[PDB]
Structure formats: C-alpha cells, structure tokens
Design a protein around this ligand. Structure first.
Ligand SMILES: [Zn+2]
Ligand SMILES: [Zn+2]
Lengths: 47, 47
C-alpha cells in the first residue's frame, strides 16, 4: 500500500497523465493508481 | 481492494466527511479511504 505508492510516486510527468501504465507497471488495481492521481493536485484539479 | 470499496462505498453521508472513521471501521490504510473520497465528486470538489 504505502510502500507501492512511495515508488510509484514521482514527478508530475506524462506517466501521471496515464495512470493505467503505472497500474500495469506495478500490476496494482486502479485503486492505488487512482489514489496517487488524487494526491497530486495537478492531476486532480485541472485549472 | 475493490471488494472493500464496494462495502465502504455508500451515500455521501457524514461518514464521507470523516474518512478516518471509515479506515478505522475496516482497518484499512488512508489509501483506500482516500481513493473513495477522490471518487466521490462531492467530497473531492468543494464548490
Ligand atoms: Zn501529477
Ligand atoms: Zn461523498
């Protein structure tokens, strides 16, 4: 849970836009990937 | 993961405002509870 996020956590690069690639890379359900998107304000709030 | 969310998922009641109580109830890390908050637009977007 928290460990997977620490590694998955990273700069707001293009991988953030494609959360699926991150779930596929770590083979985790959209839940963990979605939570990271929700924590990143840039990915969550649009403008 | 998805199973825990299904049960934890519910109407936007007061429990949604207090995500901790939900994590304590199901003994899950803020990650799962936070993801539910991010999925609920009312809890995520404020106004
Ligand atoms: Zn981001
Ligand atoms: Zn809600």
């Amino acid at each position: 849970f928290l460990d997977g996020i620490d590694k998955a956590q990273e700069e707001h690069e293009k991988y953030h836009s494609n959360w699926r690639a991150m779930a596929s890379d770590f083979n985790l359900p959209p839940v963990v990937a979605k939570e990271i998107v929700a924590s990143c304000d840039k990915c969550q709030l649009k403008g």
